[PDB]
Coordinates of all heavy atoms in Angstrom, one line a residue:
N183 N -15.2 -10.5 -7.0 CA -13.8 -10.2 -6.9 C -13.5 -8.8 -7.3 O -12.9 -8.1 -6.4 CB -13.0 -11.2 -7.8 CG -11.6 -11.2 -7.5 OD1 -10.9 -10.5 -8.2 ND2 -11.1 -11.9 -6.5
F184 N -13.9 -8.2 -8.4 CA -13.6 -6.9 -8.8 C -14.3 -5.9 -8.0 O -13.6 -5.1 -7.3 CB -13.9 -6.7 -10.3 CG -13.4 -5.4 -10.8 CD1 -12.3 -4.7 -10.3 CD2 -14.1 -4.8 -11.8 CE1 -11.9 -3.5 -10.8 CE2 -13.8 -3.5 -12.3 CZ -12.6 -2.9 -11.8
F185 N -15.6 -5.8 -8.0 CA -16.3 -4.7 -7.4 C -16.2 -4.7 -5.9 O -15.7 -3.7 -5.3 CB -17.8 -4.7 -7.8 CG -18.1 -4.3 -9.2 CD1 -19.4 -4.4 -9.7 CD2 -17.2 -3.8 -10.1 CE1 -19.7 -4.0 -11.0 CE2 -17.5 -3.5 -11.4 CZ -18.8 -3.6 -11.8
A186 N -16.5 -5.8 -5.3 CA -16.5 -5.9 -3.8 C -15.1 -6.0 -3.2 O -14.8 -5.3 -2.2 CB -17.4 -7.0 -3.4
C187 N -14.3 -6.9 -3.7 CA -13.0 -7.2 -3.0 C -11.8 -6.4 -3.5 O -10.8 -6.4 -2.8 CB -12.8 -8.7 -3.2 SG -14.0 -9.6 -2.2
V188 N -11.9 -5.8 -4.7 CA -10.8 -5.0 -5.2 C -11.1 -3.5 -5.3 O -10.4 -2.7 -4.7 CB -10.3 -5.5 -6.6 CG1 -9.3 -4.6 -7.2 CG2 -9.8 -6.9 -6.4
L189 N -12.1 -3.1 -6.0 CA -12.4 -1.7 -6.2 C -12.8 -1.0 -5.0 O -12.3 0.1 -4.8 CB -13.5 -1.6 -7.3 CG -13.8 -0.3 -8.0 CD1 -12.4 0.4 -8.5 CD2 -14.8 -0.6 -9.1
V190 N -13.6 -1.6 -4.1 CA -14.0 -0.9 -2.9 C -12.8 -0.6 -2.0 O -12.6 0.5 -1.6 CB -15.2 -1.7 -2.2 CG1 -15.4 -1.2 -0.8 CG2 -16.6 -1.5 -3.0
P191 N -12.0 -1.6 -1.8 CA -10.7 -1.4 -1.0 C -9.8 -0.4 -1.7 O -9.2 0.5 -0.9 CB -10.1 -2.7 -0.9 CG -11.2 -3.7 -1.0 CD -12.2 -3.1 -1.8
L192 N -9.7 -0.4 -3.0 CA -8.8 0.6 -3.6 C -9.3 2.0 -3.4 O -8.6 2.9 -3.2 CB -8.6 0.3 -5.1 CG -7.6 -0.9 -5.4 CD1 -7.8 -1.2 -6.9 CD2 -6.2 -0.6 -5.1
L193 N -10.7 2.2 -3.5 CA -11.3 3.5 -3.3 C -11.1 3.9 -1.8 O -10.9 5.1 -1.6 CB -12.7 3.4 -3.8 CG -13.0 3.3 -5.3 CD1 -14.5 3.0 -5.6 CD2 -12.5 4.6 -6.1
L194 N -11.3 3.0 -0.9 CA -11.0 3.3 0.5 C -9.6 3.7 0.7 O -9.3 4.7 1.5 CB -11.3 2.0 1.3 CG -12.8 1.7 1.5 CD1 -12.9 0.3 2.1 CD2 -13.6 2.7 2.3
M195 N -8.6 3.1 0.1 CA -7.2 3.5 0.1 C -7.0 4.9 -0.4 O -6.3 5.7 0.2 CB -6.3 2.5 -0.7 CG -6.1 1.2 0.0 SD -5.1 0.1 -1.0 CE -6.2 -1.3 -1.1
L196 N -7.7 5.2 -1.5 CA -7.6 6.5 -2.1 C -8.1 7.6 -1.0 O -7.4 8.6 -0.8 CB -8.5 6.6 -3.3 CG -8.7 8.0 -4.1 CD1 -7.4 8.6 -4.5 CD2 -9.6 7.8 -5.3
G197 N -9.2 7.3 -0.4 CA -9.8 8.1 0.6 C -8.8 8.3 1.8 O -8.7 9.4 2.3
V198 N -8.2 7.2 2.3 CA -7.2 7.3 3.4 C -6.1 8.2 3.0 O -5.7 9.1 3.8 CB -6.8 5.9 3.9 CG1 -5.6 6.0 5.0 CG2 -8.0 5.1 4.4
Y199 N -5.5 7.9 1.9 CA -4.4 8.8 1.4 C -4.7 10.2 1.3 O -3.9 11.1 1.7 CB -3.7 8.2 0.2 CG -2.7 7.1 0.5 CD1 -3.0 5.8 0.2 CD2 -1.5 7.3 1.3 CE1 -2.2 4.8 0.5 CE2 -0.7 6.3 1.6 CZ -1.0 5.0 1.3 OH -0.2 3.9 1.6
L200 N -5.9 10.5 0.7 CA -6.4 11.9 0.7 C -6.5 12.5 2.1 O -6.2 13.7 2.3 CB -7.7 12.0 -0.1 CG -7.5 11.7 -1.5 CD1 -8.9 11.6 -2.2 CD2 -6.6 12.6 -2.3
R201 N -6.9 11.7 3.1 CA -7.0 12.2 4.5 C -5.6 12.4 5.1 O -5.4 13.4 5.8 CB -7.8 11.2 5.3 CG -9.3 11.2 5.0 CD -10.0 10.1 5.8 NE -11.5 10.2 5.6 CZ -12.3 10.9 6.3 NH1 -11.9 11.7 7.3 NH2 -13.6 10.8 6.0
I202 N -4.7 11.5 4.8 CA -3.3 11.7 5.2 C -2.7 13.1 4.7 O -2.1 13.9 5.4 CB -2.3 10.6 4.8 CG1 -2.6 9.3 5.6 CG2 -0.9 10.9 4.9 CD1 -2.1 8.0 4.9
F203 N -2.9 13.3 3.4 CA -2.3 14.6 2.8 C -3.0 15.8 3.4 O -2.4 16.8 3.6 CB -2.3 14.5 1.3 CG -1.5 13.4 0.7 CD1 -2.0 12.5 -0.2 CD2 -0.1 13.3 1.0 CE1 -1.2 11.5 -0.7 CE2 0.7 12.3 0.5 CZ 0.2 11.4 -0.4
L204 N -4.4 15.7 3.6 CA -5.1 16.8 4.2 C -4.7 17.1 5.6 O -4.6 18.2 6.0 CB -6.7 16.5 4.2 CG -7.4 16.7 2.9 CD1 -8.8 16.1 2.9 CD2 -7.4 18.2 2.6
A205 N -4.4 16.0 6.4 CA -3.9 16.2 7.8 C -2.5 16.9 7.8 O -2.2 17.8 8.5 CB -3.8 14.8 8.5
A206 N -1.6 16.4 6.9 CA -0.2 17.0 6.8 C -0.4 18.5 6.4 O 0.3 19.3 7.1 CB 0.6 16.3 5.7
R207 N -1.2 18.8 5.5 CA -1.3 20.2 5.0 C -1.9 21.1 6.2 O -1.4 22.3 6.3 CB -2.2 20.3 3.8 CG -2.4 21.7 3.4 CD -3.4 21.9 2.2 NE -4.8 21.6 2.7 CZ -5.9 21.9 1.9 NH1 -5.7 22.3 0.7 NH2 -7.1 21.6 2.5
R208 N -2.9 20.6 6.9 CA -3.5 21.3 8.0 C -2.5 21.5 9.1 O -2.4 22.6 9.7 CB -4.8 20.6 8.5 CG -5.6 21.2 9.6 CD -6.7 20.3 10.0 NE -7.8 20.2 9.0 CZ -8.0 19.1 8.3 NH1 -7.3 17.9 8.4 NH2 -9.0 19.1 7.3
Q209 N -1.7 20.5 9.4 CA -0.8 20.6 10.5 C 0.4 21.5 10.2 O 0.8 22.3 11.1 CB -0.3 19.2 10.9 CG -1.3 18.3 11.6 CD -0.8 17.0 12.0 OE1 0.3 16.8 12.3 NE2 -1.7 16.0 11.9
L210 N 0.9 21.5 9.0 CA 1.9 22.4 8.6 C 1.4 23.8 8.6 O 2.1 24.7 9.0 CB 2.4 22.0 7.1 CG 3.2 20.7 7.0 CD1 3.3 20.2 5.6 CD2 4.7 21.0 7.5

Side-chain angles (χ1 to χ4, degrees):
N183 195 267
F184 184 34
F185 289 171
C187 294
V188 173
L189 194 48
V190 165
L192 288 166
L193 291 168
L194 290 169
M195 287 176 238
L196 174 56
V198 175
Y199 280 109
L200 296 173
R201 288 175 176 272
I202 289 160
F203 299 126
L204 279 170
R207 178 185 74 170
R208 181 181 295 109
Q209 288 182 36
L210 286 163

